[PDB]
Amino acid sequence: YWLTSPAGDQSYQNPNYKNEEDNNTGTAIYFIHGTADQPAAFKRVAERLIDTGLPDEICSLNLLAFDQRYQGKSIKFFAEQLKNKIKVNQHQRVILMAHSRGGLVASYFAEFLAKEASIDVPLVITMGTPFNGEINSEFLAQLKQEIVEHSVSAYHFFIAKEDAIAPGESGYIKDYVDKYPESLHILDRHGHLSIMSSHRLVSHISSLLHDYIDD
Amino acid sequence: LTSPAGDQSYQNPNYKNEEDNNTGTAIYFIHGTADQPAAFKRVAERLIDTGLPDEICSLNLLAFDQRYQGKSIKFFAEQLKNKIKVNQHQRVILMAHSRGGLVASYFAEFLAKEASIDVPLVITMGTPFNGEINSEFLAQLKQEIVEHSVSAYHFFIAKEDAIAPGESGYIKDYVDKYPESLHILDRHGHLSIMSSHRLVSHISSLLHDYIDD
Known part of the structure; x- marks a missing residue:
């Protein structure tokens, strides 16, 4: 977005964060793309999230593109790389927003790698992630x-x-x-294939961030 | 107010101009037996709060006399058509709930042609199409x-x-x-789908699309 993170990912620093009486340790959002997905639309989703207004509690917005994204490679490896990038950025209490197969990656990270990495993952948001179904069915x-x-x-x-x-x-x-x-959100797509173009998506995501922050 | 058929009705204050030669599109509410009319009053009122198109004559409230326990959908549909023509309304829009939706929609498939009344929009809320009433009939x-x-x-x-x-x-x-025929609404308060304002908003924007065309 604005700048480049130590991990190489694109990053947006929050002006609302670091305000007077700033939260002692905040929450950073990570945006993961599916394989062969356009990062620019995913940046559309993040920019619209910023337009809506982000809670002061949110540390930064991060984008899992650039260094280093492969086209084809195993789920576990991608989640390990996600964990490595989170640890390079010294982030804690990360919120994951992932799309398509990326949702699997994030979920794997959130379910095995995150605890013994001592990374908190309060919210995992998946957009069109094929949990039910290459990836093994036993693993799913x-x-x-x-x-x-x-x-x-x-x-x-x-x-x-x-x-x-x-x-x-x-x-x-x-x-x-x-x-x-309340975990399931069904969005009208009038024009295929634009799930991420809906503003109802960004509205629900911002309401989720606010709900989590207020608690 | 009271409609010509005797049912509870709301007239449009803006209404239409003097030289409308169309008598007017009337909205009709069909409920299943032993259902609360007051929720239907709130949904009609919320349609009014959002704003109703000037071309639409009134909001009318049907299926009223008389919810019997074991009488067939067909009887209620015949009664509905009789009440619609008592008001001489044409190109009426049906909004119905549960089994009542079957009534309206049954009316839309056979009785409406014999009445020479157009039914542009038939809106069904939680209507059990898949399933006394025959399943072959459904x-x-x-x-x-x-x-x-x-x-x-x-x-x-x-x-x-x-x-x-x-x-x-x-x-x-x-x-x-x-x-675009399917509308899925988040139901926060169980178990009253008809209560979200998202439903009534979808109805109002649907009415706007219909009126503009």
Whole structure:
């Protein structure tokens, strides 16, 4: 955005942060893209988040592009790289916003790598992430069990209505949605394929950040 | 106010100009048996708060006399058509709830032609299309809705019903035909989908689209 982070990722520093009576240790947001996804649209989502207004509590906004993104490579490796980049930036209490396959990566990071890395992950937001389904089905099932039962992160699945009524669970975990109804967000896409172009998305995300911050 | 049929009605204060030769598009509310009319009053009132198009004559409140426990949808639809023509209204918009939606939509498929009353919009809220009433009969109504119908159908459901397996409150074939026909509303307060303001807003913007055309 504004500047480049130590990890090489694009970064936006919050003017609201570091204000008078600033939070002692804040929360940084990380924006992860799926494979072969345009980072510029994802920057559209972050810029619109800034336009809406970010809580003073939020440290910075980070973008997982540039150094270093591969086209093809294993899930575990990408999550390990995400953890490495978070540790290079010395961030704590990171909020993850991921798209498509990237949501798997973030979720893997949030479920195994994050605790013994001593990184808190309060919010994990996934947009069209194929949890139900290359990636193994056993791995998907074990990840879903970790998300439903043991996870300490709040998961929010953003999908399109066509995927909602589509048979099966696409972009969301039915068990988790049943446990937490407010986790599922269904967005009207009039023009395909623009889930991230909706302003309802940014509105819900900003309301999620505010809800988490007020608590 | 009271409508010509005797039902509870709200007249538009702006209404229309003097030289409208159209008598006027009237909105009709069909509820299932033993349902609370006051929630329907709030949804109509909220439509008024948001703003109703000047071309639309009035907001009218139907299915009223008399909710019987075991009488067929067909009887209520015949009663509805009688009440609509008592008011001589034309190109009326139907907004119906639960089994009442079947009534309205049943009316839209057979009785409306014999009345020579146009039904441009038929709006169904949590209407059990998939399922006394025959299941074969529901399938025939669904086929008539999908293929032959000339009314615009809009299905309002909650996200819980959306992700529920099967077709709940909506016809999948019609949604494939028209994606914009399906409206999924977040239901914060269980279990009253008709209560969100997002529903009534969708109705008002739908009315604006219909009036402009």
